[PDB]
Design a binder for these strands. Structure first.
Lengths: 203, 83, 153, 136, 87, 141
RNA sequence: AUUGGGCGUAAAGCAAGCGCAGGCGGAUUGAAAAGUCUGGUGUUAAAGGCAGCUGCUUAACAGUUGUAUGCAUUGGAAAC
RNA sequence: CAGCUAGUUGGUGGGGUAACGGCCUACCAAGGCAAUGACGUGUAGCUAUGCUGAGAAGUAGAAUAGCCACAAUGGGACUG
């Protein structure tokens, strides 16, 4: 299963918004307690190192909608080269095609953005692709296939959106590019790459 | 003409057999795993062509040649004085 | 100053008519810049024991020196038949060690390191051995001073 | 000890033994001989089925089977689950695994095989004890 | 005839023959003596570069090429550097 | 001169020299004596030129029979020795031989190892300079 | 447990001695060069491992180029 | 598992083999191997390699490739 049905259940327990900030943005008296009958008081009485390593892992990967072996493969790929392991890892986790679509703001949610990629509504480098696990390099153009523009949602998405500094796009022409490699501080700070990278004694 | 030869100084045991003598060589090699330096011995056969009578305790050399017989495969080429 | 505990132990001495349950705790104190100390104390309750251990550790502190965030020469810690090894890891590998070893090295403001547990695994002996191995580190500038080859030799 | 001594007598490994040897040996007909090819799990035909008591720390009435493999070996076995369908010389299938409470017993019947029908009315994890998924 | 011949070292649906000099009584893609370039009959526009140095050594001391090798030697010009030198 | 004491050499020269240094370091001794040998003389020379110990004098009697060498160990005004740990790798019956590319580095270069390749005893760093390997005598740091 | 363990009380120093073969072994000089190091050449099939590149919509993968390791011969070094 | 080996070791003339050769043959001799492991029992096709490891090395010799041996079992020879 590449899709997880429930999304707010992750934001509650993990204490981190899967979206930008709208996971617990006062939606129906939004809470922060862990899901289930036992959310009364279990704050911290056995919080161990392995627990926080798992927690950081889950905050990092389900936010991108990735599975375990796929992300292990991503680690094996990023270990091939030489450089700062954490920054390179997070750059790889940022180079995914569906992630770039959200950075373009073509979809309200990353979950929605991943769906356009599968159906072929996203065209990359003049050759259409339908795989969300593409690794992109700087200077790659992205277009909306010049087809299926008349989505009542894509217009509501590309109209208003926060474009990060490390990428640039044109709203009207539906054309963008991957300008440069993002910096750690330019992304949400609730992800400590060190714990995830040092928990991998697997390889 | 890439013919070869093995410089193996040996210790002839005896010429007891008919016009044939046994040469003993103490090769030094390195132990395969424990890295120590040890020596092993193996008997070599040769035939006394007639010019010399290699008695007990002489030290000689060994050269390759055709198989003159079963288990007798090397002959004398160069000889150094007795002991 | 993170004061991350390592192993609390439930100890008790017998007495006529009852068992004097007075458990003890162990703490590690480090300023993440070179200050390191440890302290073991006992009390009847968790907070009292924790406070006593922190006071004992912070009262007796001792310094360590950092070169590129790592040990620079391999050293083995011989103490109480429980050996701990340190090695000069290259800059990319990051922190890898056991429980108590990771606690000590992380609170020492350190970085990348290579360790391997030897002998027993009782936390107090591991702490003693690791501290001994890290303080017998003889600085390159020190041997430069005590030799005639001070000029980068 | 000294290097000059281990050359004469090299070291010898411990050579630990298998946890369950019955499933490893096998023998054919037509010049029968043992070939010990470490097969994962064999089957067998039960010969004696009864109950026995466990050792000191526990207390129960555990049901066991004295099954005979495809070869001539006889091995004790524990019958898991709620009840059993062992039927006095009915063929079954086995699987390794040690039980602390029963000395000698070092095997389990895989429930869901030829005759040993799986535990009925078991809906927790449904995989061990050979249970089918109930209708939705 | 030590025969310069093609070897299907490659994956299914995507063959990749490597021109090689091997004895006639040897199976496909087996042991060989020397390697002579390769062929990729999926990529077009002169995708058959070879060594051209030791191939002449092979032909000049006895080697019968195969029909598929004919184009791979003619397009580069091996015949036009071999036939007259043969005389 | 006028040592007024009988001194003898233990055994193979490499082990004999190291034990005296280690024991003197541990007991805070300053002067020791031992029988002389050109291997030991050369290793003491390279040791003193690597700045690990004070004066050594090789002494001969009023004849050509016996030669002995006495060497003082480097100290400080605060009485801390320069020698920290000595360990011999070469050993009778365990002759160790490493090529140039496998030349060891003692405590990340902080220590000094004695490697007599072809020109007598000769330090590991100048061994890398001359890129010649051979016998490995002992680690000193 | 060669690197990488131990034998007082935890398993383990034979009851002791005479001892051949074996291992080890004082100082100095000479030669040889068997060990030791190093230079050249030959070889160590191909595929695979490692690094880079290309091609499969990207990986799995395939191809592509370099890559270790030992052996034999030859020329020197003389510290052990 | 302490002796094993009687074409077993050597020579002389001959035959035979693509060729050297106790491979065989007539004669004369009694040697050869073995504690640095012969002979015998049991097991196993060997290797490049897969897996694990940090490394020495452990592990099975999957796919594939090189070599070896076989084609119900035991022998014989023709053509080439």
């Amino acid at each position: 299963m590449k899709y997880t049905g429930s999304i707010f259940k992750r934001s509650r327990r993990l204490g981190f918004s899967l979206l930008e900030n709208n996971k617990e943005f006062s939606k129906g008296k939004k809470r922060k307690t862990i899901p289930g009958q036992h959310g009364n008081r279990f704050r911290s009485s056995t919080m161990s190192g392995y627990a926080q390593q798992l927690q950081e892992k889950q905050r990092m990967q389900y936010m991108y909608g990735i599975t375990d072996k796929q992300f292990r493969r991503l680690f094996r790929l990023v270990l091939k080269q030489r450089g700062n392991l954490a920054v390179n890892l997070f750059r790889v986790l940022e180079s995914r095609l569906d992630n770039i679509v959200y950075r373009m703001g073509f979809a309200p949610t990353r979950r929605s953005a991943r769906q356009l990629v599968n159906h072929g509504h996203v065209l990359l480098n003049d050759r259409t692709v339908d795989t969300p696990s593409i690794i992109l390099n700087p200077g790659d153009k992205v277009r909306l296939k010049a087809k299926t523009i008349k989505i009542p949602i894509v217009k509501a998405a590309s109209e208003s959106g926060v474009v990060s500094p490390f990428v640039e796009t044109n709203n009207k022409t539906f054309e963008g590019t991957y300008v440069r490699f993002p910096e750690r501080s330019e992304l949400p700070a609730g992800i400590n790459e060190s714990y995830v990278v040092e928990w991998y004694k697997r390889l | 003409k890439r013919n070869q030869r093995k410089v193996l100084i040996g210790i002839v045991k005896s010429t007891k057999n008919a016009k044939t003598a046994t040469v003993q060589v103490e090769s030094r090699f390195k132990h395969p795993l424990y890295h120590k330096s040890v020596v092993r011995h193996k008997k070599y056969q040769a035939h006394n062509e007639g010019e010399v009578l290699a008695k007990d305790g002489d030290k000689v050399q060994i050269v390759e040649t055709r198989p003159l017989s079963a288990t007798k495969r090397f002959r004398i080429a160069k000889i150094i004085e007795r002991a | 100053f993170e004061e991350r505990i390592v192993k609390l132990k439930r100890i008790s001495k017998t007495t006529k008519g009852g068992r004097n349950m007075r458990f003890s705790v162990l703490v590690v104190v480090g300023n993440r810049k070179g200050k390191i100390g440890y302290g073991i104390a006992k009390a009847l309750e968790v907070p009292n024991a924790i406070k006593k251990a922190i006071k004992a550790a912070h009262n007796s502190l001792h310094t360590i020196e950092i070169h590129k965030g790592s040990i620079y020469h391999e050293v083995i810690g011989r103490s109480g038949a429980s050996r701990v090894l340190l090695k000069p890891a290259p800059q990319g590998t990051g922190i890898i060690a056991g429980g108590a070893i990771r606690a000590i090295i992380e609170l020492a403001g350190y970085s990348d390191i290579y360790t391997k547990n030897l002998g027993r695994n009782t936390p107090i002996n591991m702490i003693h051995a690791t501290m001994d191995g890290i303080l017998k580190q003889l600085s390159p500038r020190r041997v430069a001073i005590l030799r005639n080859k001070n000029l980068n030799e | 000890a000294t290097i000059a001594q281990l050359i004469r007598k090299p070291r010898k490994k411990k050579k630990v033994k298998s946890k369950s040897p019955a499933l490893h040996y096998n023998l054919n007909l037509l010049n029968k001989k043992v070939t010990n090819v470490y097969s994962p799990l064999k089957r067998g035909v039960c010969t004696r089925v009864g109950t026995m008591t466990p050792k000191k720390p526990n207390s129960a009435l555990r049901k066991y089977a004295k099954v005979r493999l495809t070869n001539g070996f006889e091995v004790l076995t524990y019958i898991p689950g709620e009840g059993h369908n062992l039927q006095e010389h009915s063929v079954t299938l086995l699987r390794g695994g040690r039980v602390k409470d029963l000395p000698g017993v070092r095997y389990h019947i895989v429930r869901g095989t030829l005759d040993t029908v799986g535990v009925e009315k078991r809906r927790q994890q449904r995989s061990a004890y050979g249970a089918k998924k109930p209708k939705a | 005839m030590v025969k310069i011949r093609l070897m299907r070292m490659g994956r299914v649906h995507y063959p990749t023959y490597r021109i090689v000099a091997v004895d006639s009584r040897v199976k496909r893609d087996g042991k060989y003596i020397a390697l002579i370039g390769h062929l990729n009959p999926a990529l077009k526009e002169n995708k058959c570069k070879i060594d051209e140095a030791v191939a002449l050594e092979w032909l000049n001391k006895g080697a019968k090429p195969t029909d598929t090798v004919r184009s791979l030697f003619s397009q580069t010009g091996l015949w036009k550097k071999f036939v007259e030198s043969k005389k | 001169i006028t040592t007024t004491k009988p001194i003898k050499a233990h055994f193979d020269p490499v082990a004999d020299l190291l034990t005296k240094i280690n024991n003197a370091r541990k007991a805070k001794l300053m002067t020791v004596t031992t029988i002389a040998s050109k291997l030991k003389i050369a290793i003491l020379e390279i040791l003193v030129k690597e700045g690990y110990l004070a004066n050594f004098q090789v002494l001969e009697n009023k004849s050509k029979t016996k030669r002995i060498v006495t060497f003082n160990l480097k100290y400080t005004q605060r009485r801390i020795p320069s020698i920290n740990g000595v360990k011999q790798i070469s050993k009778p019956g365990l002759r160790i031989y490493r090529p140039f590319e496998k030349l060891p580095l003692v405590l990340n270069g902080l220590g000094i190892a004695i490697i007599s390749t072809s020109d007598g005893v000769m330090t590991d760093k100048v061994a890398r300079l001359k890129k010649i390997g051979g016998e490995i005598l002992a680690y000193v740091w």
